């Protein structure tokens, strides 16, 4: 992402929704599932939540 990479870890018990780079934008679904409202506002905004 140019600078400050996002080192995230997955326990491998969850599949990865995307394989390629695809220019993933903020809030995009890396892995599928019901998303918590804390992450929605955090990566989307108040109106989104």
């Amino acid at each position: 992402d140019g600078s400050d990479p996002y080192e995230e870890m997955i326990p491998k018990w969850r599949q990865l929704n995307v394989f390629e780079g695809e220019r993933v934008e903020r809030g995009d679904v890396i892995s599928d599932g019901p998303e918590a409202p804390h992450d929605i506002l955090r990566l989307r905004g108040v109106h989104a939540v």
Binding site: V18, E22, D28
Partner: protein, 160 residues
Amino acid sequence: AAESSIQVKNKGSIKLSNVKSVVNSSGKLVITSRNTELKLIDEFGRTKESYKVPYGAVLAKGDGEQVAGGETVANWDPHTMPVITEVSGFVRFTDMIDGQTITRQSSLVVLDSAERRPALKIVDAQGNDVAQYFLPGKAIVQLEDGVQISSGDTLARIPQ
């Protein structure tokens, strides 16, 4: 609902938004974007239908075409998301081990991460270098080397 067909109630032209146009083996296109949107425009801006389209889907009718309704507009596998080949030509298989990373069902599995995923680009014609191919668990490629597969085509992936 094991049926992957999408029915349309009324004759509204499809409006495919947030999609990526990739040339397939036929006149239809395959979308490589996970997030896709469909809409129905018949007489005004209002959208009659929305539904949803996963990655690796093939649209029966092109965007902006006034579908008569009651017919499928996009078809895709309801069990697997196909992987589109960016380069058309022979499939380049690297580090093919028989007896450990090969499972006879030709249709042969690629590799197993637990048992051990080499990455290679699709050859131009026979073996020319032109793309990274990732093989997750239980991923199988039924296309042998030298198959000369065209762009937009995919074999069964066999999800884990």
